[PDB]
């Protein structure tokens, strides 16, 4: 699975960026930056269940 789609959805939902112009490398760097973050408590609990 390639997460470029996930990052593109994230940027599109941010509502102020031009995802069509944001290149792929920036999106994958954003994915790397996101990967290090902890997961929200509720979402993590749902995933564990």
């Amino acid at each position: 699975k390639k997460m470029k789609a996930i990052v593109e959805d994230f940027l599109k939902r941010l509502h102020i960026f031009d995802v069509a112009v944001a290149p792929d490398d920036q999106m994958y760097r954003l994915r790397d930056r996101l990967r290090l973050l902890p997961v929200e408590v509720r979402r993590l609990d749902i995933f564990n269940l």
Binding site: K1, K2, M3, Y28
Partner: protein, 49 residues
């Protein structure tokens, strides 16, 4: 002068065989899916996905 005894010989060979040339049409080669194609170190060639 023609001498029958000195001219009569017996030639020996094989009865039949088939000579092939391609030598690789007998090899059926497939390729793993390109996404999970590993390099010499046994890790995916492109691992930024």
């Amino acid at each position: 002068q023609f001498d029958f005894r000195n001219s009569m010989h017996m030639l020996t060979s094989n009865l039949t065989f088939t000579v092939y040339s391609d030598l690789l049409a007998f090899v059926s080669a497939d390729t793993v899916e390109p996404i999970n194609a590993v390099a010499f170190d046994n890790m995916r060639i492109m691992n930024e996905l």
